[PDB]
Amino acid sequence: GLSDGEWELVLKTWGKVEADIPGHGETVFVRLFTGHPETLEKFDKFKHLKTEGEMKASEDLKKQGVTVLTALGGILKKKGHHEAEIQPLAQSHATKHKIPIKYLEFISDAIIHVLQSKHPAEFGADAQGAMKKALELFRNDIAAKYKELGFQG
Numbered sequence: 354g355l356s357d358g359e360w361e362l363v364l365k366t367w368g369k370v371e372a373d374i375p376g377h378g379e380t381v382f383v384r385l386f387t388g389h390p391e392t393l394e395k396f397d398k399f400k401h402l403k404t405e406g407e408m409k410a411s412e413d414l415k416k417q418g419v420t421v422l423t424a425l426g427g428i429l430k431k432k433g434h435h436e437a438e439i440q441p442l443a444q445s446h447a448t449k450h451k452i453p454i455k456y457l458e459f460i461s462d463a464i465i466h467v468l469q470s471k472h473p474a475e476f477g478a479d480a481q482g483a484m485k486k487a488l489e490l491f492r493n494d495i496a497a498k499y500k501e502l503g504f505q506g
């Protein structure tokens with residue numbers, strides 16, 4: 354996993370996300386959908402949004418952003434002891450939503466990009482490295498659960 358030092362950097366960084374969860378959540382989805390349009394086909398409630406302007410204006414899309422970052426924040430706060438919180442999530446994503454593990458890689462990249470754009474001077478190589486390692490741990494644990502459930506991880 355990560356050292357206590359690395360977890361400290363991930364939590365301080367997350368401190369910046371918590372100051373505007375809706376703003377960061379909205380940007381992560383606009384990057385994700387514009388960057389990897391196939392991901393949009395998994396959200397039956399958003400498929401009709403075709404332009405960047407329509408996405409930016411969607412309060413429903415902003416609410417989804419809040420849901421995702423709220424859940425992820427709760428997990429990162431566990432510093433690796435997140436067996437309990439990941440289980441339900443792998444379960445719904447694999448079996449109900451049908452999200453390939455690769456889309457979790459796309460959304461992680463989107464998170465890194467938003468942090469770079471919104472906090473360019475404050476999100477340095479140390480904080481970025483730690484944030485990448487935490488998201489990698491998170492994805493690897495989900496992937497492990499997908500395999501347990503009989504899906505490709």
Ligand code: HEM
Pocket residue numbers: 392393395396397398420421422424425441442445446450452456457460
């Ligand atoms: C950091 C990664 C993510 C987190 C923490 C996360 C979390 C959430 C949670 C908390 C919900 C609501 C409860 C549930 O249904 O399980 C949810 C709903 C959903 N998630 Fe994710 N998710 C992640 C990534 C993704 C990705 C990459 C996709 C699609 C490309 C996806 C698609 C969905 C869909 C289709 C739903 C239902 C939306 C609506 O309610 O119809 N998720 N996710």
Ligand SMILES: [C-]#N
Pocket residue numbers: 417421
């Ligand atoms: C999942 N959003």
